[PDB]
Amino acid sequence: NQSKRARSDALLWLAANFPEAFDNSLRIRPLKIGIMSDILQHAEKAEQVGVSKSKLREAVVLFTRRLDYLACLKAREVRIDLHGNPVAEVTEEEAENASMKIKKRVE
């Protein structure tokens, strides 16, 4: 319960500070491989408002396990950094891994 609200807080902090990556009100886009390391460079600012590094990791894990995120991992879609800049493209293997994950969760 407390850990859940702490995870939700981390997700709200991610959407407020990096909405290009984590504001999913209209769209969701593939994230850079290693986006977690980029987020953790901001850990000091997050901790001042009550968000720990481990809650930042839990929030990214929750965000990227959602089916709508897995569904956006299609071959040659663009991966973005925290500010929505294009950095790479989704590979066929990554797209296959994502669809396999979706099929497992609905079963």
Residue numbers in the entry: 19 to 125
Paper text:
The ProQ/FinO family of RNA binding proteins mediate sRNA-directed gene regulation throughout gram-negative bacteria. The RocC/RocR system regulates competence, a specialized physiological state involving the coordinated expression of multiple genes which allows the bacteria to uptake environmental DNA and integrate it into its chromosome (i.e., natural transformation). RocC binds and stabilizes RocR, which in turn binds and represses a series of mRNA targets that encode components of the DNA uptake system.
Deletion of the N-terminal 13 residues, which are disordered in our structures, did not impact RNA-binding affinity or transformation repression. Furthermore, we tested the binding affinity of a RocC construct containing an additional C-terminal predicted helical region (RocC1-137). This construct had the same binding affinity as 1–126, indicating that this additional region does not play a significant role in RNA binding.
